[PDB]
Amino acid sequence: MLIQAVGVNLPPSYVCLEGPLGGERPRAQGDEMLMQRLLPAVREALDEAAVKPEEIDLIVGLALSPDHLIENRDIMAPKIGHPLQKVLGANRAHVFDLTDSSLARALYVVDTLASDQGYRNVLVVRGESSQGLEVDSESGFALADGALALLCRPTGKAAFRRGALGGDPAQEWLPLSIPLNTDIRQVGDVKGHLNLPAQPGLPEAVRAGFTRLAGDFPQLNWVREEWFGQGRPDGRCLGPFELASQLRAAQRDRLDELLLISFDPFGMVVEGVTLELAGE
């Protein structure tokens, strides 16, 4: 899988939460919705790669937010990939969604499908506008809000690893869940609650998992997701959106191959995908 261009658009509003799994993360405010940031992120990648929206063959989306997706903040399905196709004008494109998948796992699956079907311009998007999800105030965990656009060119040659978290190998990590809000009174109320039990050793175990998985590709530099503020400067972390700056840094340094590693809070594993990069 080749990364032609990367686009990112994050809200300027940062909200800090305390706890072992807390941190300072961007958060959508008021009536803001995901498409406000997703579209400019996509157009940024398309412009960078000199690709017109008509040329897009495939669109795959990742977004947990149950509302605040599009102009009608109340719509939850079909997923945001279809509204995006409409505003973009990607009339040749196929659209689907990989739900709670990690970005690394999605890039791997998409590289397989897109190469096998002969696609040349593929768009993988990750975004959140989580006003509709209550954060885990006990542990401090919360999703970062924003949008990430990866314009890719498939090759079918991407490698994949699904590795365990570091730390105590016998520790049963409690996974993330998003229970439904049982007492919804107004359409604007939160639709679900983030539940990730307070586990002070998790942020380092995730980092340890990243380093372990990267050991399978020692010749590759790698990029990562940071979901937690612990050990991070100012307590700030952008979750999956940390990848944008790291990817662009790899571009400035003219790297042609990379390892991208994600953290899956639902499966409590780390997943890596090998990638190619486009030069200048």
Binding site: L64, A77, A93, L98, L180
Partner: protein, 348 residues
């Protein structure tokens, strides 16, 4: 004196099974008491006479029946759990309700989805869990994903699951709730050990022009009674020719190098008789080359296709060595078609 060509592995559709809710609901069932605008022409137009609804009171949910169906299929196909390389699940309802023994205390949830939980429940210790969504065409997507994985040698056994618990999103104060129903489907795809079976070609495309027509939305009932609580409801508000499904079939046939006359049978999504009839005629399929199955099951979203495929096999309408076409549309909107060379498919 020449080099050798690489060959994609052939994809075998090894086994398939479905699990429908035990209880059926007639059109005159009291469930539709609060529904207005129920004409006899409405029922005849959509071709639905009965439908299935999961009964959670007796342990019927999107997860329990999948375990049952999956365990049934795994045992019937003599497939070891640790031999499954990938598990691809789909569930159009954003609301899930059961996680078996994996997350026993977790009830109604938006996330996680099913793949990872089910793999742990079933013991698929080597399976990569994936959860895709293409609504009514998710079964075709999962076959497409599984096939490409098998073709490129990244998996040798892929377990596909579609579980539609759509009744929990039906607004029974609106007549929109009269068409859709619940159901489960499980299928096993493997690397072909011969030329018996293969996915010859497929075509997927999407058009979002009419996206807002069919949506899942957080709203109040259309005709509420008393203190109305907001809920996630299937919403159909909007104000046309079915050509994209034929387009998908033409593209798939051309990629496979075949024509409509080379196809022995057809399996369509089951939205309404007049749409299946339109799709069939748009590609040149004759009435005896496909079935209408919504009559006793309703529109089971992504399960209509695998259920129709199963009945075709079970009833002898689809035989080994037959070349079939599977096609359908889906909210979004999306369209998928697949040209299959079928061998012996285990029905269980």
């Amino acid at each position: 004196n020449l080099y050798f060509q690489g060959h994609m592995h052939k994809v075998k559709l090894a086994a398939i099974t479905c699990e429908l809710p035990a209880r059926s609901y007639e059109n005159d069932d009291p469930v539709f008491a609060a529904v207005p605008d129920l004409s006899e022409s409405w029922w005849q137009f959509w071709g639905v006479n009965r439908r299935g609804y999961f009964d959670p009171r007796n342990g019927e949910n999107e997860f329990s029946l999948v375990v049952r169906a999956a365990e049934r299929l795994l045992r019937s196909s003599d497939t070891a759990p640790d031999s499954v390389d990938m598990l691809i699940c789909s569930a159009s309802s954003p609301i899930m309700t059961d996680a078996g023994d994996v997350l026993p205390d977790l009830r109604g949830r938006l996330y996680p989805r099913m793949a990872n939980v089910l793999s742990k429940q079933l013991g698929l210790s080597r399976a990569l869990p994936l959860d895709s969504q293409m609504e009514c065409a998710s079964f075709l997507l999962n076959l497409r994903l599984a096939a490409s994985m098998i073709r490129q040698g990244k998996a040798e056994k892929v377990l596909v699951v579609c579980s539609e618990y759509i009744s929990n999103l039906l607004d029974f104060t609106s007549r929109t709730s009269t068409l859709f129903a619940d159901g489960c489907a499980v299928a096993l795809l493997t690397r072909g050990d011969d030329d018996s079976c293969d996915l010859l070609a497929s075509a997927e495309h999407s058009d979002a022009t009419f996206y807002e027509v069919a949506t899942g939305r957080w709203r109040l009932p259309e005709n509420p009674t008393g203190e109305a609580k907001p809920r996630l409801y299937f919403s159909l508000f909007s104000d046309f020719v079915p050509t994209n499904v034929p387009i998908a079939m033409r593209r798939a046939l051309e990629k496979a190098g075949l024509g409509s006359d080379d196809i022995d049978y057809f399996v369509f999504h089951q939205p309404a008789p007049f749409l299946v009839k339109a799709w069939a005629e748009g590609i040149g399929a004759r009435p005896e080359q496909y079935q209408l199955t919504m009559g006793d099951t309703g529109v089971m979203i992504s399960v209509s296709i695998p259920y129709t495929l199963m009945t075709g096999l079970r009833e002898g309408k689809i035989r080994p060595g037959d070349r079939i076409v599977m096609a359908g549309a889906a909210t979004g909107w999306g369209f998928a078609a697949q040209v299959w060379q079928l061998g012996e498919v285990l029905v269980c």
